[PDB]
Design a protein around this ligand. Structure first.
Ligand SMILES: *[C@@H]1O[C@H](CO)[C@@H](O[C@@H]2O[C@H](CO)[C@@H](O[C@@H]3O[C@H](CO)[C@@H](O)[C@H](O[C@H]4O[C@H](CO)[C@@H](O)[C@H](O)[C@@H]4O)[C@@H]3O)[C@H](O)[C@H]2NC(C)=O)[C@H](O)[C@H]1NC(C)=O
Ligand SMILES: *[C@@H]1O[C@H](CO)[C@@H](O[C@@H]2O[C@H](CO)[C@@H](O[C@@H]3O[C@H](CO)[C@@H](O)[C@H](O)[C@@H]3O)[C@H](O)[C@H]2NC(C)=O)[C@H](O)[C@H]1NC(C)=O
Ligand SMILES: *[C@@H]1O[C@H](CO)[C@@H](O)[C@H](O)[C@H]1NC(C)=O
Lengths: 48, 48, 712, 48
């Protein structure tokens, strides 16, 4: 009603894939102890 | 079946759930009337 | 009486009274839109119309809310970042596809002040369909993952948004989708005055340079309804005067038709008059019109006006006319979309296309013979009705929405300052005299007589008034200019040349130390003729990559770089192309596929079977990145190039225009023996060409004084 | 559309009929009422 978040203001979850993150990464970071660490910023899908 | 889950520990929820209208479907939701009901969900349970 | 102005003000803005106080228009500041209602109608009860949304929700008070760009609710074959519930002004999102996919369009897009995203639409495509991926414009939803031939896709906008463009697109023969790309418009997006006249002239000049021979009709319809105003008609009269002089500035004098309507149509100038082609006489009629009778009959009967346009172009049992399959028709109309009399005007539009033989065939659509442009005058505009009347041609806009009238007068003085680079290259109009050299005007036939070695029968391409582009191995340094004769246009005589300009990197015997007798790297040359070529119906040039005329021929913005054009003509897929061959003293076309995607590797490794190349170690030593590869068995059986077709153009047919992207160089297997075509070709019979995108600094230097307009 | 009964004559009738969505205005006469399974038929002879 007047209380609650308005239904038009709610943006619905839409992205429900079965598989994603199909990317190539090259470990070009400086190697400490023979080990290269790449930090990736990824965006999670709407699936639960 | 739209299943609403309530995984809160000890808080029951009063939820108004509404189905949006689509011209490709024929339900009770029209253009000038909303198909919304308000239900109560106990904690650690679900309601269909 | 007039409505009371109580309880109708808006939180954070003002208003202005239009239509003599019978309609208010909310004026929010720059960056805001009035919540739902843009305007309010004065119902005759004392109170204004309720603040109803697109969902018909009763809002009590109005408020100027912030402008959001439409969120991407659907995107396939990749990942866009960041995801947000809404996007403010000047937000940026970027696109990036998965492995094994090519990104075309703008990778970095920005939300502007007009509620639209900048650049072109980002598309992740794999190159497996006959047509390309139509992609998802931001705000839409695409239904249809198959991109084969005869397939279709349907589009839908979000809630409260109006579709502009084609709702359904169909893949046609040749690799071109029907209709136009959609774009979700709102109740406040409008169009900037620069974007209106920029797209309108790039459509209009296409259906003018094909008329080039007197064979074009232009119909002018003006709305005189009471919902526009008496003060808004005379400002539209002075706008239409500027339109006629811009059309007559191209040397073409078409026939004009002036009809102003409201409740009834009134014909001022008919196209069936002896003075309608005189462009100065129609301008004299435009000042003599008076709108006092249309003000008495206040109404919007759009259907009865278009029935008068049908009666002007129809013939009363005249029995096929001489310009029935050769006359371009252009219909220009201004309206507000709010028609209430006569009925649906779309039923008259379908009768016009049936009379002009448009859509009644599968091999000849004839979509270039009817263009319809609709302009939106006021804020009171039904964007659905104006979109269904206008035409939907590929890579082009025909629907426009502007406000306050005076800015539409600002787009007509701006378009005459804008100069359009007219391109006579690649123009083949269907004349019923279909002998060869009419279908292929650019094709040059080159003959070199050598002392007892024989006659060298090569080919070339007319690129300018003085230059003919061909291969470099047809000539040597010993061949003099008196022993080289070039013939164009099917003419019996031979034209004499001035100089043969070889590329500075050409060296055919530069690999004899490595055991390789031939070396066709940089196999291009120019032939500067002695006499200037006169352009007509049988001799016309062919367009070249990264020029000003190539940019307008693809309907791209003029800010298109040379790297953006290489992403357009030669993408990383199998590209449909064609070349010209001579079959029994008659010229014919052979459609091939350019292996530029994942089949580029299987095509290039077949060069080991060439004569002399049977013992070459590294296969990439003889195939530089200056090469393109055609022919083979996958995905189709392409016809192979002969020895006499050497030096010819490798042409790409896109949107009824022909662009050369390569020069024919050499082949592995000689399937032509000057007796027939050897009907049992092998599977590795590939042919190689010279990529014109790699020889651009040499072509720009040698053709700097030719008015071609190369890009920086 | 609505029960109405507000009348108001042309001030609440011309403005609804002259909206851009309204296509036809007829005055008819009912001839035959035919009940037939899925849709009900009302045959109206057009007077003006
Ligand atoms: C404007 O409209 C008229 C009327 O529709 C149209 O006339 C058509 O002209 C074409 C030629 O331009 C005709 O096509 C040929 O007609 C002859 C008889 O005249 C037939 O024998 C032909 O069949 C053979 O030839 C073909 C190759 O030429 C082969 O592919 C075919 O297999 C046959 O061997 C061929 O059909 C056509 O018949 C008429 N149509 C009518 C109804 O008269 C005119 O061309 C239009 N103008 C333009 C510029 O399109
Ligand atoms: C589209 O726009 C993006 C930015 O919005 C452009 O990305 C830029 O790409 C360069 C790579 O040449 C980035 O440089 C690198 O950044 C990483 C950050 O982790 C750093 O570790 C590297 O040493 C290197 O400096 C650059 O940062 C990046 N820009 C931004 C603002 O991050 C992209 O090139 C644009 N593409 C097109 C086609 O316009
Ligand atoms: C956009 O503007 C609103 C206005 O308050 C703000 O709340 C929001 O954080 C901004 N950014 C995004 C990504 O929505």
């Amino acid at each position: 009603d007047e209380d609650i978040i308005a239904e038009e203001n709610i943006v619905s979850r839409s992205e429900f894939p079965e598989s994603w993150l199909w990317n190539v990464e090259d470990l070009k970071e400086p190697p400490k102890n023979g080990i290269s660490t790449k930090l990736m910023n990824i965006f999670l899908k709407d699936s639960i | 079946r739209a299943v609403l889950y309530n995984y809160r520990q000890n808080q029951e929820l009063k939820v108004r759930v509404e189905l949006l209208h689509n011209p490709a479907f024929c339900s009770l939701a029209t253009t000038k009337r909303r198909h919304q009901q308000t239900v109560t969900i106990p904690p650690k349970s679900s309601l269909s | 009486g007039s409505c009371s102005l109580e309880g109708v003000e808006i939180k954070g803005g003002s208003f202005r009274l239009l239509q003599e106080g019978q309609a208010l228009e909310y004026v929010c500041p720059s960056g805001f839109y009035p919540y739902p209602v843009q305007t309010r109608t004065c119902r005759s009860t004392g109170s204004w119309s309720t603040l109803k949304t697109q969902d018909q929700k009763t809002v009590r008070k109005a408020e100027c809310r912030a402008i959001h760009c439409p969120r991407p609710h659907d995107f396939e074959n990749g990942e866009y970042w960041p995801r947000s519930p809404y996007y403010n002004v000047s937000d940026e999102i970027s696109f990036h596809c998965y492995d094994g996919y090519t990104l075309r369009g703008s990778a970095n897009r920005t939300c502007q002040v007009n509620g639209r995203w900048s650049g072109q639409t980002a598309i992740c495509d794999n190159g497996a369909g006959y047509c390309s991926n139509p992609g998802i414009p931001i705000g839409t939803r695409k239904v249809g993952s198959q991109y084969r031939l005869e397939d279709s896709v349907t589009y839908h906008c979000s809630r409260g948004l109006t579709l502009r463009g084609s709702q359904r697109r169909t893949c046609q023969e040749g690799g071109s989708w029907s209709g136009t790309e959609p774009s979700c418009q709102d109740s406040f997006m409008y169009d900037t005055p620069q974007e209106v006249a920029e797209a309108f002239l790039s459509s209009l000049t296409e259906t003018i340079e094909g008329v080039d021979a007197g064979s074009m009709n232009i119909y002018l319809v003006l709305d005189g309804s009471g919902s526009i105003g008496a003060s808004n008609f005379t400002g539209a009269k002075k706008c239409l005067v500027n339109l006629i002089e811009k059309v007559a500035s191209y040397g073409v004098k078409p026939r004009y038709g002036l009809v102003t309507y409201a409740t009834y149509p009134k014909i001022w100038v008919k196209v069936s008059e002896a003075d309608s082609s005189n462009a100065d006489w129609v301008t004299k009629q435009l000042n003599e019109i008076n709108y006092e009778d249309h003000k008495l009959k206040s109404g919007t009967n759009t259907k009865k006006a278009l029935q008068a346009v049908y009666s002007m172009m129809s013939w009363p049992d005249d029995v096929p006319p001489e310009g029935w399959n050769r006359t371009r028709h252009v219909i220009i109309l201004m309206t507000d979309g709010l028609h209430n009399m006569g009925g649906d005007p779309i039923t008259v539009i379908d009768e016009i296309r049936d009379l002009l033989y448009i859509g009644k065939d599968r091999k000849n659509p004839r979509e270039d013979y009817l263009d319809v442009y609709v302009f939106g005058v006021g804020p009171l505009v039904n964007q659905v009705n104006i979109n269904a009347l206008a035409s939907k041609k590929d890579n082009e806009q025909h629907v426009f929405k502007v406000k306050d009238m005076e800015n539409l007068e600002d787009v007509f003085y701006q378009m005459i300052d804008e100069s359009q680079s007219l391109s006579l290259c690649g123009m083949v109009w269907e004349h019923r005299k279909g002998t060869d050299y009419h279908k292929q005007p650019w094709q040059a036939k080159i003959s070199v007589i050598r002392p007892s070695k024989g006659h060298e029968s090569c080919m070339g391409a007319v690129v300018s008034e003085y230059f003919v582009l061909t291969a470099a191995h047809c000539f040597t340094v010993d061949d003099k200019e008196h022993s080289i004769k070039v013939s164009v246009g099917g003419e019996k005589r031979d034209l004499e040349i001035e100089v043969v300009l070889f590329h500075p990197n050409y060296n055919i015997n530069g690999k004899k130390e490595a055991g390789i007798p031939e070396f066709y790297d940089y196999d291009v040359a120019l032939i500067k003729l002695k006499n200037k070529l006169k352009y007509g119906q049988t001799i016309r040039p062919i367009c070249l990559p990264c020029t000003e005329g190539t940019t307008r021929a693809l309907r791209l913005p003029p800010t298109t770089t040379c790297q953006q054009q290489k992403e357009e003509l030669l993408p990383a897929q199998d590209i449909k192309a064609l070349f010209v061959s001579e079959e029994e003293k008659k010229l014919t076309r052979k459609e091939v596929y350019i292996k530029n995607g994942d089949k580029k590797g299987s095509c290039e490794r077949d060069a080991q079977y060439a004569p002399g190349y049977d013992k070459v170690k590294d296969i990439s030593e003889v195939v530089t990145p200056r090469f393109l590869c055609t022919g083979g068995v996958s995905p189709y059986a392409d016809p192979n190039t002969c020895r006499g077709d050497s030096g010819g153009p490798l042409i790409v047919h896109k949107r009824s225009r022909f662009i050369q992207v390569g020069v024919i160089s050499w082949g592995v297997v000689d399937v032509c023996k000057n007796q027939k075509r050897q009907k049992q070709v092998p599977a590795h019979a590939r042919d190689f060409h010279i990529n014109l995108f790699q020889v651009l600094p040499w072509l720009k230097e040698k053709l700097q004084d030719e008015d071609l307009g190369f890009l920086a | 559309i609505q029960k109405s009964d507000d009348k108001v004559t042309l001030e609440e009738r011309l403005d609804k009929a002259c909206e851009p969505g309204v296509d036809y205005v007829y005055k008819t006469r009912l001839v035959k009422v035919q009940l037939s399974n899925d849709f009900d038929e009302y045959i109206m002879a057009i007077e003006q």
